Amino acid sequence: ASITAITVENLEYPAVVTSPVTGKSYFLGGAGERGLTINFIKFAAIGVYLEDIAVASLAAKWKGKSSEELLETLDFYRDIISGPFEKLIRGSKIRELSGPEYSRKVMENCVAHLKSVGTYGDAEAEAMQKFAEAFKPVNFPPGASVFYRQSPDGILGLSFSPDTSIPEKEAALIENKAVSSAVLETMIGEHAVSPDLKRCLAARLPALLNEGAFKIGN
Template identity: 50%
Template structure:
């Protein structure tokens, strides 16, 4: 449904590392429509509350992070973990459970490497589990590699991508633009 990239400026040049796709279960549209129908893409883009509702909404989310440049699992997971921990500390919810979830997250990635074209796949269930899968050949695996049962981690991974301080403003903009279109096309039923 939505795409963006993540990169950084190196010596005055923007270097893209990953391409990111964010997909929401169909039930997200009627759930979001009651409050957000009729809003422009720019209004949605600027709304922290809108993206919090996407992250916490009672529908499945799927995120595909595809490598443009090679990256090790350790590099990727350390950066994501750092972003998640900073977010939790900022909102005052960092606990032993989150520390353990971060340990599991780092463990899942420690021996992985991602050449260009390889993908990391995150599925967030409405119940709070985070399923992590890997694809080296463009095929989405039927069974996840690992499942981490931690509601804050599940949400923080997506928040770290599309949230206000997320690593991919392009993915955030794409989500806002596409959902603005889909909400306008919906019947506007409330949640």
């Protein structure tokens, strides 16, 4: 039919979001849940937004592929993760979480990843320190959100909100190529814990990739 909003555990993810920081417009690629290993306890919801130009970019290699084919093609997610377009990730809590509580397990996966690809030098350790620091003064009562703005120019912007509305400014800009893609790498890349996100993107992209390009209006 047409692109749609996704609701996760009562956390609405709009079909379209426009960034107040770069003016770029994104479309919902998919949403997912993320919880713990104790009974599986769901803690947060996650939505991956891709800039509208991402469609033209992915078109040549992926238009025509079925959702079944996309889901199994690791190379599909590498074009999503490292594609020449901005990505926006919004994590919204189901269960209250302080900055550090949350930033804790996010940095875990990120540090691991960077280590397994040989890109975790001082610069990378420094950037992750700035990342931890941006989360310290923040708290995430259910409904509250963190917006990771992954710039194509190697910037990772960090925004925090009381609800699911997008902030007008960012609390921090982390300038490191490897780290900029790390967060998205941990959610939809090869060694992603939960399939939820990868499955959702495989499901909703085929419809789009076939309509050529896609511009979220003037």
